[PDB]
Design an enzyme around this catalytic site. Structure first.
Site, mmCIF file in Angstrom:
data_model
loop_
_atom_site.group_PDB
_atom_site.id
_atom_site.type_symbol
_atom_site.label_atom_id
_atom_site.label_comp_id
_atom_site.label_asym_id
_atom_site.label_seq_id
_atom_site.Cartn_x
_atom_site.Cartn_y
_atom_site.Cartn_z
ATOM 1 N N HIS A 139 67.814 -14.313 22.144
ATOM 2 C CA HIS A 139 68.967 -14.438 21.254
ATOM 3 C C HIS A 139 70.034 -15.398 21.794
ATOM 4 O O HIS A 139 71.070 -15.580 21.140
ATOM 5 C CB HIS A 139 69.571 -13.058 20.928
ATOM 6 C CG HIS A 139 70.327 -12.406 22.048
ATOM 7 N ND1 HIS A 139 69.865 -11.280 22.699
ATOM 8 C CD2 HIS A 139 71.543 -12.675 22.581
ATOM 9 C CE1 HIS A 139 70.750 -10.904 23.610
ATOM 10 N NE2 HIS A 139 71.779 -11.733 23.556
ATOM 11 N N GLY A 142 78.557 -10.749 28.632
ATOM 12 C CA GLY A 142 78.053 -11.743 29.553
ATOM 13 C C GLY A 142 76.945 -11.244 30.444
ATOM 14 O O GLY A 142 76.361 -12.041 31.185
ATOM 15 N N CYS A 167 74.021 -9.955 29.527
ATOM 16 C CA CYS A 167 72.777 -9.908 29.007
ATOM 17 C C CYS A 167 71.897 -10.942 29.737
ATOM 18 O O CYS A 167 72.372 -11.997 30.164
ATOM 19 C CB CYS A 167 72.840 -10.081 27.477
ATOM 20 S SG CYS A 167 73.471 -8.493 26.805
HETATM 21 N N1 WBE Z 1 75.864 -4.748 27.783
HETATM 22 C C1 WBE Z 1 76.756 -5.073 27.206
HETATM 23 C C2 WBE Z 1 77.967 -5.505 26.409
HETATM 24 C C3 WBE Z 1 79.038 -4.624 26.246
HETATM 25 C C4 WBE Z 1 80.142 -5.021 25.514
HETATM 26 C C5 WBE Z 1 80.165 -6.299 24.969
HETATM 27 C C6 WBE Z 1 79.100 -7.173 25.143
HETATM 28 C C7 WBE Z 1 77.988 -6.782 25.874
HETATM 29 C C8 WBE Z 1 76.763 -7.734 26.109
HETATM 30 C C9 WBE Z 1 76.276 -8.413 24.810
HETATM 31 N N2 WBE Z 1 75.170 -9.298 25.084
HETATM 32 C C10 WBE Z 1 75.957 -7.313 23.765
HETATM 33 O O1 WBE Z 1 75.310 -6.313 24.099
HETATM 34 N N3 WBE Z 1 76.417 -7.456 22.523
HETATM 35 C C11 WBE Z 1 76.180 -6.440 21.509
HETATM 36 C C12 WBE Z 1 75.874 -7.100 20.163
HETATM 37 C C13 WBE Z 1 74.422 -7.646 20.159
HETATM 38 C C14 WBE Z 1 74.183 -8.943 20.582
HETATM 39 C C15 WBE Z 1 72.882 -9.433 20.591
HETATM 40 C C16 WBE Z 1 71.831 -8.617 20.179
HETATM 41 CL CL1 WBE Z 1 70.210 -9.213 20.183
HETATM 42 C C17 WBE Z 1 72.067 -7.323 19.751
HETATM 43 C C18 WBE Z 1 73.363 -6.834 19.752
HETATM 44 CL CL2 WBE Z 1 73.650 -5.217 19.237
HETATM 45 C C19 WBE Z 1 77.444 -5.590 21.316
HETATM 46 O O2 WBE Z 1 78.499 -6.123 21.160
HETATM 47 N N4 WBE Z 1 77.322 -4.264 21.290
HETATM 48 C C20 WBE Z 1 78.477 -3.383 21.072
HETATM 49 C C21 WBE Z 1 79.128 -3.045 22.418
HETATM 50 C C22 WBE Z 1 80.413 -2.204 22.221
HETATM 51 O O3 WBE Z 1 81.215 -2.507 21.399
HETATM 52 N N5 WBE Z 1 80.613 -1.143 23.000
HETATM 53 C C23 WBE Z 1 81.853 -0.333 22.846
HETATM 54 C C24 WBE Z 1 81.528 1.070 22.261
HETATM 55 C C25 WBE Z 1 80.588 1.836 23.231
HETATM 56 N N6 WBE Z 1 80.312 3.151 22.640
HETATM 57 C C26 WBE Z 1 81.286 4.244 22.782
HETATM 58 N N7 WBE Z 1 82.347 4.243 23.552
HETATM 59 N N8 WBE Z 1 82.997 5.476 23.391
HETATM 60 C C27 WBE Z 1 82.311 6.190 22.530
HETATM 61 N N9 WBE Z 1 82.629 7.544 22.075
HETATM 62 N N10 WBE Z 1 81.231 5.446 22.129
HETATM 63 C C28 WBE Z 1 78.035 -2.103 20.359
HETATM 64 C C29 WBE Z 1 77.504 -2.474 18.955
HETATM 65 C C30 WBE Z 1 78.385 -2.511 17.879
HETATM 66 C C31 WBE Z 1 77.918 -2.845 16.613
HETATM 67 C C32 WBE Z 1 76.574 -3.148 16.426
HETATM 68 F F1 WBE Z 1 76.116 -3.475 15.200
HETATM 69 C C33 WBE Z 1 75.694 -3.113 17.500
HETATM 70 C C34 WBE Z 1 76.162 -2.772 18.762
#
Ligand code: WBE
Ligand code: WBE
Lengths: 306, 306
Positions: A41, A143, A145
């Site tokens: 990705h 960052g 990933c």
């Molecule tokens: N590692 C890591 C990481 C962490 C933060 C930011 C960026 C990264 C690396 C980066 N590469 C990453 O993973 N980006 C993913 C988006 C992504 C990029 C590409 C692909 Cl292929 C697949 C995906 Cl899903 C991403 O942003 N996911 C957020 C992370 C979030 O917002 N977390 C805070 C809440 C934790 N939950 C909670 N906290 N407290 C309670 N009670 N619950 C969750 C999400 C939100 C909507 C959604 F539709 C899917 C997923």
């Protein structure tokens, strides 16, 4: 004496981490010989992430669209291919720091060391287990990933995890190094849910043996159980069923401590039914399930403290 | 998201570990430039350990009595000196893998990564805190002595611990890299007791802030406390007194979360007085005190999850 979550020394992996940039997307890659492995990705823009057709996206790319940086030197990409959810970038320079390595796909319940990296620079190392629901409870920020998980055996690095995403619940999902996800997940930015998780029973038993080896027996009892009756209690407390294969794997720890596996199961049953009553085991007030039997043998003494 | 005990990447230290043998005693040494540092009790036989006169023992040694092995190459010792409880062996080859480094003597409450080594070969890495009673709760077996503890800052390795012994209670004692013990301990094979330990209050507060940053607030309350009244509760539960310096150090975490330090102290007071009532914080059922404020800033997001 002592017992800690212990990672493998990370140097052999540190020398393989690089930075991969496509457009405005930058993540980590793994440089082995003349190939860089990274999450596919990287080729997506922020809008591509919602529902990407990766084959259609990749055919629109050229080798020179990929910027690979190893420390302060750029590596020229001379070919590219997609294998499941990983991109493989052929570069014009073989990594002189390539360790002896293998790619392995692990089973749930197995552990590995994670080298958390940002912009191709390693930041920390910690131990993870693959949960029964095929997530890991990592520590990762934007960052991260492309960071990898690994085990080391006699200077051979077995890579088993590449980090791809954090789920809405804050746990983590990724692939083997051939790009196949652990679990049902797909690499698109959609809210995906993991299955309900369970506790890794054979690992809790291993950790109880670690406690005995280190000199603590307070949780033992005079009772035994059958495997069937133990698993009836296991199901009640959301523990994974214990198999005869698990019993066999615990053989060496049982032999070192003189505690039969089904006798330790009776201890665990009592701990589940009665709690700890304010006591700790190896400094924990909860039953720990992220040490495998191998992890215990690796770290604990080969002779029990009597 | 997530929060784990996270060690520094160990590669820069791995390339410095060697094996030192004198007579039938073998332990680990640290090879920087053309000097190998190791515990001076390598020069003792099993009988010398009871009450050694190290100056009398060392004057009876020659350079060629010391066998230093780096991987599969022997290093010739061309001089030796004793600095407090460390032996310094000048060798004829400078370590080509010497990182930028410093020696630092840390304060109790600070953390560091331990590279556990056996026969000069690294086996694992884990995080430790220097306890208020100047022991560490490590994981070490016979042959581990001479293993080192360190922190890394922008590719500079600050070595702060060299392992010398396990006490009768199973906790660990050692020196800075200039050979001065942490705590009252001496390097002889006598049963030595540490002072009574206490919980590192500023670290527990830092970890509560880590939990808030990661998205959890269940333990917060609407109350505040004075510093004096908080410390009256701290003394009751064997916590270290919280100073205004500690309050200042927690400044950035307080500013990021919007929770005043004395408000978090009121949360901690309630947790000490009422327990957790079956709940967990960052997956722990106990209050964790081996994360410094720096450790939290290093690992957690710079923006709180609201
Ligand atoms: N590692 C890591 C990481 C962490 C933060 C930011 C960026 C990264 C690396 C980066 N590469 C990453 O993973 N980006 C993913 C988006 C992504 C990029 C590409 C692909 Cl292929 C697949 C995906 Cl899903 C991403 O942003 N996911 C957020 C992370 C979030 O917002 N977390 C805070 C809440 C934790 N939950 C909670 N906290 N407290 C309670 N009670 N619950 C969750 C999400 C939100 C909507 C959604 F539709 C899917 C997923
Ligand atoms: N790391 C480490 C390590 C661990 C095991 C073996 C060897 C090593 C490295 C090696 N270099 C090492 O430290 N040797 C020291 C001896 C030594 C060598 C040189 C110098 Cl200068 C100073 C010293 Cl004291 C050593 O043998 N210490 C044992 C370790 C022990 O027997 N632990 C099991 C009980 C844990 N406590 C417990 N378990 N369960 C409950 N409820 N309590 C304790 C002791 C016993 C008598 C004594 F007089 C002093 C100390």
């Amino acid at each position: 004496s002592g017992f800690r979550k212990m990672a493998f020394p990370s140097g052999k992996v540190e020398g393989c981490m690089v930075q991969v940039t496509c457009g405005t997307t930058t993540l980590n890659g793994l440089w082995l010989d003349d190939v860089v492995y990274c999450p596919r990705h990287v080729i997506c823009t922020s809008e591509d992430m919602l529902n990407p057709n990766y084959e259609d996206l990749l055919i629109r790319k050229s080798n020179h669209n990929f910027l690979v940086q190893a420390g302060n030197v750029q590596l020229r990409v001379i070919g590219h291919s997609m294998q499941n959810c990983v991109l493989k970038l052929k570069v014009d320079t073989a990594n002189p720091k390539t360790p002896k390595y293998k790619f392995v796909r692990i089973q749930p319940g197995q552990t590995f060391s994670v080298l958390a990296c940002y912009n191709g620079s390693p930041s920390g190392v910690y131990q993870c287990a693959m949960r029964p629901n095929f997530t890991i409870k990592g520590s990762f920020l934007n960052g991260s990933c492309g960071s990898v998980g690994f085990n080391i055996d006699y200077d051979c690095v077995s890579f088993c995890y590449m980090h791809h995403m954090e789920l809405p619940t804050g746990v983590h999902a990724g692939t083997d190094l051939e790009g196949n996800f652990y679990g049902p997940f797909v690499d698109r930015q959609t809210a995906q849910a993991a299955g309900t998780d369970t506790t890794i029973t054979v690992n809790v038993l291993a950790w109880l043996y670690a406690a005995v080896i280190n000199g603590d027996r307070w949780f033992l009892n005079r009772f035994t159980t059958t495997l069937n009756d133990f698993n009836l209690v296991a199901m009640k407390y959301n523990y994974e069923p214990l198999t005869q294969d698990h019993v066999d794997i615990l053989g060496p720890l049982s032999a070192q401590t003189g505690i039969a596996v089904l006798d330790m199961c009776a201890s665990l049953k009592e701990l589940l039914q009665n709690g700890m009553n304010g006591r700790t085991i190896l400094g924990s007030a909860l039953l720990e399930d992220e040490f495998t039997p191998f992890d215990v043998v690796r770290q604990c003494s080969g002779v029990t403290f009597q």
